[PDB]
Amino acid sequence: ETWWYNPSIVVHPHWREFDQVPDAVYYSLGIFIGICGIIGCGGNGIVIYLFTKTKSLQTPANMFIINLAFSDFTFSLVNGFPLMTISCFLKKWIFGFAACKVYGFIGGIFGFMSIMTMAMISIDRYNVIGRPMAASKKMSHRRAFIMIIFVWLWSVLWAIGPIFGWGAYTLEGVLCNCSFDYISRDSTTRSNILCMFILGFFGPILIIFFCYFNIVMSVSNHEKEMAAMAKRLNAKELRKAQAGANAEMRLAKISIVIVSQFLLSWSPYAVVALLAQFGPLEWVTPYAAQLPVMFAKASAIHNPMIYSVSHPKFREAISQTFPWVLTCCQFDDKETEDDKDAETEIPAGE
Ligand SMILES: CCCCCCCCCCCCCCCCCCCCCC
Ligand SMILES: *C/C=C(C)/C=C/C=C(C)/C=C/C1=C(C)CCCC1(C)C
Ligand SMILES: CCCCCCCCO[C@@H]1O[C@H](CO)[C@@H](O)[C@H](O)[C@H]1O
């Protein structure tokens, strides 16, 4: 007697009043997310593969990048094909309630994980760039490792709530994927939602700003200091130190872009969410929630691409392993020069 009938999950009444979006929409959605899965898993596999095998990229900090890639790989995997894609092509979620929970639970856990991982990357950047050259700190495997343990502890904490009643993962949009329940306005769900948002999200965002705004408010602190030591009897060997800071600033610059990618990726959705939980639910329509979530899912597939066009060592690696990828973004040795000077160690001060 209806088109949203799911014998496994109880569809919130809100999604039931609307009319079924057109077949083309379902087919496109599936095809769309199915490509997020391919590019997402491919691109992140490529970054994990290269970052773990290439000795040039073998630095403690990079572990965070590995962690971010494993996070996005999984997101793209579980969230694209087959769970959602297949659902779409049938215009129905057919994998049951447990699959739904797992689906939504994985979705949030790694979403939180990627920003909190980016947080750690923002903190690393602050050590080697935000502080002065005199006290610059490089990430140590020990530090890094504990840091990713925080990331995993954390992420799971703010996404597991619904698994235990404190909130709930269920069907949303055109009913072919799952997420957290942002409609149901009771106490339990509202605190979890406020929690997910404030701790899972606003949380690492502060870390991010505090670190970058701290790296900008030290650009000059370093600009002056670079000269003080410059004329401080520092020979041609000064050039070395200079390329290194250029090197790091390049990675620091990268950080912000992948983070920017994230925000611009999740904010839309986050917003439509809160509207439904606090504002005009008549606003939160099929496409009002759907499309902005799609855009949110594809987020886990941009990092690999940002690296492929802005990471020298990594781009070097691709050129040497899957060069057919860097076609439209051809690699050149000159892109690795700054790392040469920075690493080349002057013997006995020459
Ligand atoms: C399940 C059936 C899939 C049919 C796909 C037909 C598509 C042709 C695609 C060729 C795909 C190569 C994908 C692996 C490469 C990962 C791309 C990610 C971009 C990474 C940039 C560093
Ligand atoms: C297909 C999408 C799924 C399974 C999404 C689940 C998402 C969450 C539990 C989202 C949490 C958030 C972030 C990771 C960042 C932005 C803000 C939130 C609170 C919406
Ligand atoms: C894009 C996210 C940036 C991740 C920061 C990785 C930090 C690795 O930065 C690396 O530090 C090494 C010394 O520890 C330097 O020798 C490398 O040139 C530099 O790329």
Residue numbers in the entry: 9 to 358
Paper quotes:
The activation process of rhodopsin is initiated by the photo-isomerization of the retinal chromophore from the 11-cis to all-trans configuration. It is noteworthy that whereas signal transduction in vertebrate vision is mediated by the second messenger cyclic GMP, signal transduction in squid photoreceptor cells uses an inositol-1,4,5-trisphosphate signaling cascade in which photoactivated rhodopsin stimulates a Gq-type G protein.
In this study, we performed a crystallographic study of the LUMI state of squid rhodopsin to elucidate the essential structural change occurring in the activation process. From this spectral feature, it was suggested that the full conversion of BATHO to LUMI occurred at 170 K. Since META was scarcely formed at this temperature, the content of LUMI after crystal warming to 170 K was estimated to be 50%. In this study, diffraction data collected using a much lower flux of X-rays (6 × 1014 photons/mm2) were merged and the merged data were used for the structural analysis of LUMI. Although the C7 = C8 double bond and the adjacent bonds are largely twisted in BATHO, these bonds take on more relaxed configurations in LUMI. This relaxation is accompanied by a large movement of the central moiety of retinal towards the extracellular side. As a consequence, the retinal polyene chain in LUMI is sandwiched by the main chain of helix III and a β-strand in the E2 loop, as observed in RHOD (and ISO). Indeed, the all-trans retinal in LUMI is gently curved so as to embrace the indole ring of Trp274. The most significant difference between LUMI and RHOD is seen in the orientation of the C13 methyl group; i.e., it points toward helix VI in RHOD, whereas it points towards helix III in LUMI. This alteration is accompanied by reorientation of the Schiff base NH bond; i.e., it is directed towards Asn87 of helix II in RHOD, whereas it is re-orientated towards Asn185 in LUMI. A peculiar feature of the photoreaction of squid rhodopsin is seen in that the position/orientation of the β-ionone ring of retinal, which is tightly fixed by the surrounding aromatic residues, remains unaltered upon the formation of LUMI.
